[PDB]
Each structure stands twice: as C-alpha cells, then as structure tokens.
Design a protein around this ligand. Structure first.
Ligand SMILES: Nc1nc2c(ncn2[C@@H]2O[C@H](COP(=O)(O)OP(=O)(O)OP(=O)(O)O)[C@@H](O)[C@H]2O)c(=O)[nH]1
Ligand SMILES: [K+]
Ligand SMILES: [Mg+2]
Length: 388
C-alpha cells in the first residue's frame, strides 16, 4: 500500500499549502491593521510580545519569514535532517555512524564551526568533492547559502573530502560546506535509497558563540527533521532547552540521541533524568519514546570503526526508526511541522481578536471579521489527518 502513502502525502501537502496561503493573508491584515491603529495585547505559542506596535511589526515579519520557509519546505520534495546539540556531544560522531564512514571530523576538542551539508553526488554531476561557500559572497550567512549554485563557480571553492579537517574550523571564512559523497546496497544506505532525497547537516555546537548559536536557531526553520544529540553526563542543558523550546514551536516530533551513555555509572538514574526532560520539553516525543529516543554510543575515537559490521543493536534501532520516519511516514516527517506551526499561530491570532472585539467601531468590525475567519481556518487545519 505504498501508493496510498504517496496519495495521502500529496493530498495533505496540497491542504497545507492552501492553509499557509490563507494564514499568510491573515498575517498581513494584522500588519496593516496594526499600522493605522495599533493593536492591544495565558501564553502565546508563537508571537512573543508605541513599543508593542514596533515589536509587533517585528514579530509579524518573523512569522512571515517562517511561513515562507515552511511553504518552501512543503514544496520541496527532499527531506533535510539537522543534527544539532551542545558542543562536544557527538553530533559529527553520529553523522559518521549514519554514513558508515569517518567523513566528518570528530575530535575531543571543539571541531565543527561551519555547517556541513552532506549530499549524494548525483546533485553535483556525480563528483565527490567539497564545495565551500565563502562568507564574503553575501551580507549574511543565509543570503550566501541561498545564492549558492553549482553552475556559478563564483559562489564556492572546490576542495577534496580529506581537506575537511582544515575547513570546518574556518567559521570566519566559510558559511557552509556542501559535501558531495558516493556510497553499499541501496537497502542499507541512508543518503541514496531511490525514494526520498536526504541531505544531512552537521551543525556547529550550541553553547559556543553568541553569533554561532544565533546561526543554529535560524537554520532550524529551513530543515525538516531534527536529531538532537545529548551528552549523557549533562542531560539537557539550558543551552539545549532554549533551542528545543524554540524548535518545538513547529516540530512536535524530533529525535533525541543520547551519546556517551557508556561512561555513565548510574545508568538507570541517568536515563530517568533524560526522559523526564523530554516529557516536559517535547510531550509528543515522550509518547513515542521507543521510536524517537535512542542511546547510541558508537564513536570513532574510543574503543575505520564505522565500516565494521559488528553488532550494534542500539544504533541499528535508531537507524531503523529514522528510515521508517523519513521514508515510510512522509506525512508525519515532512508535513507535521507545518500543521503544528499553523495551529499554534492561528490560536495566537484567535486570542488577539478575542480581547479586541467588543472591548473605534472600525476595529470592532475588523477583529470580528478576523476572529470568525481564523477560527474557521484553525478548524480546517485540525481536520488534516497526518497519522495515516
Ligand atoms: N565513549 C563515547 N565517546 C563518544 C561518544 N560520542 C562521541 N564520543 C567521543 O567524543 C568526541 C566527540 O565527537 P564529535 O562528533 O566531534 O562531537 P561534536 O558534537 O561534533 O563537537 P563539535 O563539532 O566541536 O561542536 C569523539 O572523539 C568521540 O570519540 C559516545 O557515544 N561514547
Ligand atoms: K568536537
Ligand atoms: Mg563536530
């Protein structure tokens, strides 16, 4: 019944693009309303709030920018996996496990300073090479990543894969590293499987630089699936929770990979501490913990280690759930972030229109029209069924 999944995905994908449109329209009529007569302002899930009028304008501009990324993600047929977490938690060490090769530098000391995107060579004419995107080709980091084209040499420097160790630390020169690799049967490899185009992004560590952390939180809304690696010894830190909290505004579900669990003495107590924090941070991920919470110890430094077919039940299980989620449940893996965000945002608008109507007439009529309009929309969003 694999064809049924395709139809359901294309039907649900059609439904969400329509909802992002109508909600973007709502976002705009709020912006124009605010400008002529500032709006008057229980916790708002998305909107964080003369001072409120200018901050309001800043908020809508962010939501407008976020809906665009979601619009661009729903349209995109590929799935993007974002491996982030604290510094020195094993983000790069988890990627190597997934590719089954020591591609990305993994070191005791801080290493990854530049975003490392790993793609199949098919996109780069089947050529195994790194494409470094310079910071100086555009004003901001995103503007550079977004102007990158393989067909325009002025947007990237070509290096070899073994050049990676000397490239990833140059976060003052490069904006992103496009790594094109070639895989191994198709039923075993993750990048090339014949059904869904995946690209892994090895994130720089959280809790390192004020600017670097701003980069990660930004990049989060242009990816589809998050694998949050956790240091078993520290659990979920304030730097981690600040990210997850902001990421949970759209990602109801996401993976949690606890690494360095082999170093833990009180393994049970440590496991119960971690699980306690996922229930409070990602309540929906806790309900499906068996699928989304994994304890993987595989690494290349402690006793090519990734090629060995030695039995690794912990990792094998994670890699299975990832395949199942990204490949067999495209409705959940790709579109759930869109449905979740829309439902959160619409609730916010509904609250705003609520406090404004009844208690100039021009605003009373405007907000009643918007309350009845968004309540109706939020009802249609909830009718979208993605658990099929
Ligand atoms: N015993 C054990 N060591 C691990 C585990 N995961 C990573 N390590 C070790 O700790 C180091 C961490 O590897 P990295 O991938 O570079 O960690 P990171 O998150 O990428 O840190 P930065 O990229 O610099 O931000 C490696 O040298 C590993 O040998 C684990 O699950 N168990
Ligand atoms: K490191
Ligand atoms: Mg790293």
């Amino acid at each position: 019944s694999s064809q049924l999944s395709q139809w359901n995905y294309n039907n649900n994908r059609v439904l969400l693009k329509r909802s992002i449109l109508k909600t973007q329209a709502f976002m705009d009529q709020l912006q124009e309303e605010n400008n002529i007569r500032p709006i008057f302002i229980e916790k708002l899930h998305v909107l964080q709030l003369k001072a409120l009028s200018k901050l309001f304008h800043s908020q809508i501009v962010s939501v407008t920018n976020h809906l665009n990324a979601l619009k661009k993600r729903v349209d995109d047929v590929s799935s993007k996996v974002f491996i982030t977490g604290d510094v020195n938690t094993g983000k790069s060490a988890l990627c190597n496990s997934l590719l089954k090769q020591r591609l990305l530098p993994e070191d005791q000391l801080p290493c990854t300073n530049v975003f490392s995107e790993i793609l199949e060579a098919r996109e780069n004419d089947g050529i195994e090479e790194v494409h470094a995107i310079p910071l100086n080709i555009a004003p901001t980091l995103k503007e550079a990543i977004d102007m990158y084209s393989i067909q325009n040499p002025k947007t990237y420097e070509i290096h070899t894969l073994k050049e990676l160790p000397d490239l990833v630390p140059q976060n003052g020169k490069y904006a992103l590293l496009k790594i094109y690799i070639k895989d191994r049967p198709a039923s075993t490899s993750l990048l090339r499987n014949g059904t869904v185009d995946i690209s892994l992004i090895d994130s720089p560590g959280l809790n390192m630089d004020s600017l670097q952390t701003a980069e990660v939180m930004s990049r989060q809304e242009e990816i589809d699936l998050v694998i949050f690696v956790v240091n078993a010894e520290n659990q979920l830190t304030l730097s981690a929770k600040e990210f997850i909290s902001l990421a949970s505004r759209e990602k109801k579900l996401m993976f949690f990979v606890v690494k360095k669990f082999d170093k833990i003495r009180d393994k049970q107590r440590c496991k119960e501490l971690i699980l306690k924090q996922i229930r409070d941070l990602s309540p929906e991920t806790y309900k499906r913990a068996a699928d989304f919470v994994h304890f993987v110890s595989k690494n290349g430094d402690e006793l090519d280690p990734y090629s060995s077919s030695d039995p690794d039940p912990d990792f094998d299980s994670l890699e299975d759930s990832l395949r199942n989620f990204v490949l067999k449940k495209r409705s959940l893996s790709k579109l759930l972030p869109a449905k979740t965000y829309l439902s959160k945002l619409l609730s916010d608008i509904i609250m705003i229109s609520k406090s404004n109507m009844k208690m100039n007439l021009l605003s009373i009529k405007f907000f009643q029209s918007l309350y009845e309009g968004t309540v109706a929309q939020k009802l249609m969003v909830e009718e979208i069924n993605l658990d099929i």
